[PDB]
């Protein structure tokens, strides 16, 4: 499921090519996994009893958009639009076990807000697993005469695969050092929960 | 029984029916053997007939098999959805270009029928100051075996363009193959007849070796013996056409029907339609009482000439009345 | 006689599949002796092979982890004294893991080994999470005891 | 048809009568029609719609259904310029309708291959993206039983390729990809493309060797020297046929190459064990 979903938001972030299904399975695996495990009322106003009323993406974006014609315009425009959770309430909710969970029947806000850190998710993957497999390529980089019928133009562009994209949710799992601060100098084995990336 | 053990696709009642009786018969499927296994093989070794080829990025010729598609075309030819008639004229495309190949090119000189003419002259005569010097080199190069699978595959490629005359399409240009065939076979005829006066003539045994090795050009005869008795009638029409053809041409050639009967080749065309009586399958008995009564009631040889061939022709008629099997029908008894 | 049927049933009628060399008594032995389609042995043409690619794996890692190489300069990037010690390190990891993670299966009642026990063992132990492959509350006695430790306090 | 029991399913295949058959089928029609001219709106509906066109043309068996779809699809493929159904999706469809070669009635076979040999002689469309995914089509086409429509396939086949032995033999063995016809014998077809390379035009005869017939020009040797002159006039009838055995002869000495390689490649797509020979 939601593999067209995820096809689409991958050719917004900058895949253009055509991943295979072993591409869309992990990552629907992270995403699924992400989700399960998944002013303010710490603001300063609440110090007191009572209340008072009150009186480089950008750069490559910009790039892509100078550098796309009318037909690719309107496909990225019309894939922008895609959604893990329009329209497909109980699907969604099938497929995130709700019930097994939590009470069912949230409200829809909720289910806006997972939409919208869904496609974060995956716009962040794509965009890290692309940089891991063109440093692969550019590393790696460093006969048949006559001709056929059916072969390709150029080619050249190829998609990116299963070990990128374990690469860099590896990458996208590290933590900061101020959670390892407190064991300098001793031999304790860290162990934490599951980063929401 | 071996032929019918095949996989699931094939239908499996055969299958098991010939598993369970090879089981049941128990140790005596293994022991029937007696002699020690058939093989095939050739009858000489020399190579093949072939012509040469000529691959576009090569700067050498190669030979080709002269044989390939010969057998499948025949049997597709002679053996009878809507594209069958696109593959038999394939097929009898193929025969015919075989045919023109084995028949062979030749260039003469210009003034042909002046030596014909002189040939028949000699023929008529008995004039013995004929040099005869090229067909008694001695040949001891080549093989006999071969010459004769040649001669055999010629008659087969024959046999099928005469019965290809049953199809309303092809009997035009096959038609007129055949009486092109004919009579460029009797031109020959006339020269190997003189050669063979001259060659009795000379009772030596000088240590000079036969002739040259070439394919007989008289398996026309035995394709017509063997077309004569056919179910359809255009074949039958045909091989008594054919017949009269050669006479035709012959009398042409000579100049007058006097002397037509002392050539060599109607002595041979009696003795196969005498020796077809003698076979053991009726059609070719039938085949030869029929060329027999072609030869006596439409070419009209002479009377020296049947009263010569008398004696065989009524042993010959006699004996295919005699063999005729009790039970068949009595057609050819009849015709006899 | 036989009961030769109508019609097969489905498992007659299969198209056979490759099989591989079981038995145990070895393959490629030259003396004197089979499955329907046997399944064809793994082979390379022409390539760098495995003793290249194996050796050439940790200088791989070493240049993912550290960074990058300039141009020049590669697969001298630890010194001979610490490739044995990775070396060392990889061994002990994997039998370590195995060794644990075998035990753990067993306890169970399962007989066979699944991808669970090992994932749960690296969970569990080593804070290593692998992507792509598929609670608690208290009773009333403790509740009781709460709530008679706080009617006390006050 | 196959004859197979009915079985005791809520869901299960029924029949229908021919009347209502037909209204259903009117219906369907219109439907698709008027669904189909808004393809730039559908939206979360463009995929329902071409699988739904997929599911009707892998199992209908009505013509006129079959050939409206295909003529839909043979518009979208050529007469379309906007934003494609899902740029190269129609290929999904497409691919879909080789199920066309056994159904017993060559009628949407015979279409279906008339697009796609439509397709692979156009200028324009020439090792792009579109003429890389019909493959199958191609060589399901190269396989067909209708000697019209395989000699075309094989005569576009050839004018692709190259004319060196060498190169011919080095795309049948390393540049083609037989997966389509693995089931089936394909030597045949790699047969014929080998022998495109091959001279046709010049003569042939068989080595000085072998055995033909007995020539005139041997007989008629002994008389080179001899001047003399015939008892007996020439004539009309003579000099006529003389002058048609000449012509004959001269007919005998113009066999090509062709005359017999191009039977041998024709029949041999009728029987396995010549194609073997070959």
């Given at each position: 499921?939601?593999?067209?979903?995820?096809?689409?938001?991958?050719?917004?972030?900058?895949?253009?090519?055509e991943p295979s299904l072993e591409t869309t399975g992990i990552?629907?695996?992270?995403?699924?996994?992400?989700?399960?495990?998944?002013?303010?009322?710490?603001?300063?106003?609440?110090?007191?009893?009572?209340?008072?009323?009150?009186?480089?993406?950008?750069?490559?974006?910009?790039?892509?958009?100078?550098?796309?014609?009318?037909?690719?315009?309107?496909?990225?425009?019309?894939?922008?639009?895609?959604?893990?959770?329009?329209?497909?309430?109980?699907?969604?909710?099938?497929?995130?076990?709700?019930?097994?969970?939590?009470?069912?029947?949230?409200?829809?806000?909720?289910?806006?807000?997972?939409?919208?850190?869904?496609?974060?998710?995956?716009?962040?993957?794509?965009?890290?697993?692309?940089?891991?497999?063109?440093?692969?390529?550019?590393?790696?980089?460093?006969?048949?005469?006559?001709?056929?019928?059916?072969?390709?133009?150029?080619?050249?562009?190829?998609?990116?695969?299963?070990?990128?994209?374990?690469?860099?949710?590896?990458?996208?799992?590290?933590?900061?050092?101020?959670?390892?601060?407190?064991?300098?100098?001793?031999?304790?084995?860290?162990?934490?929960?599951?980063?929401?990336? | 029984?071996?032929?019918?053990?095949?996989?699931?696709?094939?239908?499996?009642?055969?299958?098991?029916?010939?598993?369970?009786?090879?089981?049941?018969?128990?140790?005596?499927?293994?022991?029937?053997?007696?002699?020690?296994?058939?093989?095939?093989?050739?009858?000489?070794?020399?190579?093949?007939?072939?012509?040469?080829?000529?691959?576009?990025?090569?700067?050498?010729?190669?030979?080709?098999?002269?044989?390939?598609?010969?057998?499948?075309?025949?049997?597709?030819?002679?053996?009878?959805?809507?594209?069958?008639?696109?593959?038999?004229?394939?097929?009898?495309?193929?025969?015919?270009?075989?045919?023109?190949?084995?028949?062979?090119?030749?260039?003469?000189?210009?003034?042909?029928?002046?030596?014909?003419?002189?040939?028949?002259?000699?023929?008529?005569?008995?004039?013995?100051?004929?040099?005869?010097?090229?067909?008694?080199?001695?040949?001891?190069?080549?093989?006999?075996?071969?010459?004769?699978?040649?001669?055999?595959?010629?008659?087969?490629?024959?046999?099928?363009?005469l019965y290809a005359e049953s199809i309303p399409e092809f009997?035009?240009?096959?038609?007129?193959?055949?009486?092109?065939?004919?009579?460029?076979?009797?031109?020959?005829?006339?020269?190997?007849?003189?050669?063979?006066?001259?060659?009795?003539?000379?009772?030596?045994?000088?240590?000079?070796?036969?002739?040259?090795?070439?394919?007989?050009?008289?398996?026309?005869?035995?394709?017509?013996?063997?077309?004569?008795?056919?179910?359809?009638?255009?074949?039958?029409?045909?091989?008594?056409?054919?017949?009269?053809?050669?006479?035709?041409?012959?009398?042409?050639?000579?100049?007058?029907?006097?002397?037509?009967?002392?050539?060599?080749?109607?002595?041979?065309?009696?003795?196969?339609?005498?020796?077809?009586?003698?076979?053991?399958?009726?059609?070719?008995?039938?085949?030869?009482?029929?060329?027999?009564?072609?030869?006596?009631?439409?070419?009209?040889?002479?009377?020296?000439?049947?009263?010569?061939?008398?004696?065989?022709?009524?042993?010959?008629?006699?004996?295919?009345?005699?063999?005729?099997?009790?039970?068949?029908?009595?057609?050819?008894?009849?015709?006899? | 006689?036989?009961?030769?049927?109508?019609?097969?049933?489905?498992?007659?009628?299969?198209?056979?599949?490759?099989?591989?060399?079981?038995?145990?008594?070895?393959?490629?032995?030259?003396?004197?002796?089979?499955?329907?389609?046997?399944?064809?042995?793994?082979?390379?043409?022409?390539?760098?092979?495995?003793?290249?690619?194996?050796?050439?794996?940790?200088?791989?890692?070493?240049?993912?982890?550290?960074?990058?190489?300039?141009?020049?300069?590669?697969?001298?990037?630890?010194?001979?004294?610490?490739?044995?010690?990775?070396?060392?390190?990889?061994?002990?990891?994997?039998?370590?893991?195995?060794?644990?993670?075998?035990?753990?299966?067993?306890?169970?009642?399962?007989?066979?080994?699944?991808?669970?026990?090992?994932?749960?063992?690296?969970?569990?132990?080593?804070?290593?999470?692998?992507?792509?492959?598929?609670?608690?509350?208290?009773?009333?006695?403790?509740?009781?005891?709460?709530?008679?430790?706080?009617?006390?306090?006050? | 048809?196959?004859?197979?029991?009915?079985?005791?399913?809520?869901?299960?295949?029924?029949?229908?009568?021919?009347?209502?058959?037909?209204?259903?089928?009117?219906?369907?029609?219109?439907?698709?029609?008027?669904?189909?001219?808004?393809?730039?709106?559908?939206?979360?509906?463009?995929?329902?719609?071409?699988?739904?066109?997929?599911?009707?043309?892998?199992?209908?068996?009505?013509?006129?259904?079959?050939?409206?779809?295909?003529?839909?699809?043979?518009?979208?493929?050529?007469?379309?310029?906007?934003?494609?159904?899902?740029?190269?999706?129609?290929?999904?469809?497409?691919?879909?309708?080789?199920?066309?070669?056994?159904?017993?009635?060559?009628?949407?076979?015979?279409?279906?291959?008339?697009?796609?040999?439509?397709?692979?002689?156009?200028?324009?469309?020439?090792?792009?993206?579109?003429?890389?995914?019909?493959?199958?089509?191609?060589?399901?086409?190269?396989?067909?039983?209708?000697?019209?429509?395989?000699?075309?396939?094989?005569?576009?086949?050839?004018?692709?390729?190259?004319?060196?032995?060498?190169?011919?033999?080095?795309?049948?063995?390393?540049?083609?990809?037989?997966?389509?016809?693995?089931?089936?014998?394909?030597?045949?077809?790699?047969?014929?493309?080998?022998?495109?390379?091959?001279?046709?035009?010049?003569?042939?005869?068989?080595?000085?060797?072998?055995?033909?017939?007995?020539?005139?020009?041997?007989?008629?040797?002994?008389?080179?020297?001899?001047?003399?002159?015939?008892?007996?006039?020439?004539?009309?009838?003579?000099?006529?046929?003389?002058?048609?055995?000449?012509?004959?002869?001269?007919?005998?000495?113009?066999?090509?190459?062709?005359?017999?390689?191009?039977?041998?490649?024709?029949?041999?797509?009728?029987?396995?064990?010549?194609?073997?020979?070959?």
């Amino acid at each position: 499921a939601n593999w067209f979903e995820l096809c689409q938001m991958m050719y917004v972030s900058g895949e253009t090519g055509e991943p295979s299904l072993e591409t869309t399975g992990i990552i629907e695996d992270i995403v699924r996994q992400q989700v399960i495990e998944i002013g303010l009322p710490w603001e300063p106003a609440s110090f007191y009893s009572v209340e008072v009323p009150e009186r480089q993406r950008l750069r490559k974006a910009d790039e892509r958009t100078k550098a796309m014609t009318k037909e690719e315009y309107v496909t990225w425009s019309e894939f922008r639009q895609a959604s893990f959770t329009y329209r497909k309430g109980k699907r969604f909710r099938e497929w995130a076990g709700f019930g097994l969970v939590t009470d069912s029947k949230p409200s829809d806000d909720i289910i806006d807000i997972l939409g919208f850190l869904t496609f974060e998710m995956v716009q962040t993957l794509t965009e890290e697993a692309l940089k891991i497999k063109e440093q692969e390529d550019l590393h790696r980089e460093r006969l048949t005469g006559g001709g056929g019928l059916f072969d390709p133009p150029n080619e050249g562009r190829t998609p990116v695969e299963p070990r990128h994209i374990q690469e860099a949710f590896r990458r996208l799992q590290q933590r900061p050092k101020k959670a390892r601060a407190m064991l300098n100098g001793t031999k304790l084995q860290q162990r934490t929960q599951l980063k929401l990336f | 029984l071996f032929d019918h053990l095949k996989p699931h696709p094939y239908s499996h009642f055969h299958a098991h029916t010939t598993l369970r009786i090879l089981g049941k018969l128990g140790g005596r499927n293994r022991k029937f053997m007696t002699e020690a296994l058939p093989v095939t093989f050739q009858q000489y070794v020399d190579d093949r007939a072939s012509f040469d080829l000529r691959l576009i990025g090569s700067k050498r010729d190669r030979a080709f098999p002269a044989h390939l598609g010969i057998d499948l075309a025949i049997q597709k030819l002679t053996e009878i959805r809507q594209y069958d008639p696109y593959y038999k004229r394939q097929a009898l495309n193929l025969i015919i270009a075989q045919t023109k190949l084995r028949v062979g090119f030749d260039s003469v000189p210009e003034d042909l029928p002046r030596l014909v003419r002189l040939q028949v002259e000699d023929l008529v005569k008995k004039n013995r100051d004929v040099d005869i010097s090229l067909f008694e080199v001695s040949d001891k190069e080549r093989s006999i075996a071969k010459k004769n699978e040649e001669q055999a595959l010629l008659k087969r490629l024959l046999k099928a363009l005469l019965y290809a005359e049953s199809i309303p399409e092809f009997k035009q240009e096959v038609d007129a193959l055949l009486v092109n065939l004919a009579r460029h076979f009797t031109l020959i005829e006339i020269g190997r007849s003189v050669i063979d006066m001259k060659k009795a003539y000379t009772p030596f045994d000088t240590k000079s070796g036969e002739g040259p090795l070439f394919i007989d050009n008289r398996v026309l005869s035995e394709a017509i013996l063997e077309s004569l008795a056919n179910e359809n009638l255009e074949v039958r029409e045909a091989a008594k056409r054919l017949i009269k053809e050669m006479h035709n041409a012959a009398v042409t050639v000579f100049g007058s029907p006097m002397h037509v009967p002392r050539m060599t080749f109607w002595s041979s065309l009696a003795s196969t339609f005498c020796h077809g009586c003698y076979e053991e399958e009726w059609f070719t008995k039938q085949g030869g009482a029929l060329g027999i009564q072609t030869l006596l009631t439409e070419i009209d040889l002479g009377d020296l000439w049947v009263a010569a061939k008398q004696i065989e022709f009524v042993r010959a008629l006699m004996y295919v009345v005699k063999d005729m099997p009790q039970d068949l029908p009595e057609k050819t008894r009849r015709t006899a | 006689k036989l009961p030769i049927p109508k019609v097969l049933h489905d498992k007659a009628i299969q198209m056979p599949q490759p099989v591989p060399n079981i038995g145990g008594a070895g393959s490629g032995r030259p003396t004197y002796t089979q499955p329907a389609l046997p399944k064809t042995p793994a082979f390379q043409l022409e390539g760098e092979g495995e003793r290249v690619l194996n050796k050439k794996k940790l200088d791989e890692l070493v240049r993912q982890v550290c960074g990058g190489t300039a141009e020049g300069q590669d697969g001298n990037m630890l010194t001979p004294e610490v490739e044995e010690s990775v070396l060392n390190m990889a061994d002990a990891f994997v039998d370590n893991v195995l060794h644990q993670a075998c035990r753990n299966a067993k306890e169970r009642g399962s007989k066979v080994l699944e991808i669970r026990d090992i994932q749960l063992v690296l969970e569990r132990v080593y804070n290593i999470r692998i992507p792509g492959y598929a609670k608690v509350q208290p009773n009333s006695n403790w509740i009781k005891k709460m709530s008679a430790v706080q009617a006390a306090k006050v | 048809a196959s004859g197979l029991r009915p079985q005791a399913d809520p869901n299960a295949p029924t029949e229908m009568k021919a009347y209502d058959l037909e209204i259903q089928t009117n219906l369907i029609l219109k439907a698709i029609e008027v669904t189909a001219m808004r393809m730039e709106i559908l939206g979360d509906n463009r995929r329902p719609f071409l699988s739904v066109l997929a599911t009707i043309v892998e199992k209908s068996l009505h013509i006129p259904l079959c050939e409206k779809i295909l003529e839909m699809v043979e518009g979208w493929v050529f007469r379309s310029e906007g934003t494609w159904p899902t740029l190269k999706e129609k290929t999904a469809v497409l691919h879909k309708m080789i199920s066309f070669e056994h159904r017993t009635d060559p009628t949407m076979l015979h279409k279906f291959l008339n697009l796609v040999l439509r397709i692979y002689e156009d200028p324009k469309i020439t090792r792009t993206e579109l003429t890389v995914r019909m493959e199958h089509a191609f060589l399901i086409g190269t396989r067909a039983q209708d000697v019209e429509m395989r000699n075309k396939f094989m005569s576009i086949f050839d004018k692709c390729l190259s004319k060196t032995a060498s190169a011919r033999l080095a795309y049948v063995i390393l540049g083609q990809n037989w997966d389509t016809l693995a089931d089936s014998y394909w030597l045949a077809q790699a047969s014929q493309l080998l022998l495109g390379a091959v001279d046709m035009n010049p003569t042939i005869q068989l080595h000085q060797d072998d055995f033909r017939t007995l020539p005139i020009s041997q007989l008629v040797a002994p008389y080179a020297k001899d001047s003399r002159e015939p008892s007996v006039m020439i004539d009309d009838k003579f000099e006529a046929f003389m002058a048609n055995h000449r012509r004959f002869l001269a007919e005998l000495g113009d066999v090509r190459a062709r005359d017999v390689l191009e039977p041998l490649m024709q029949l041999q797509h009728i029987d396995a064990n010549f194609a073997h020979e070959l």
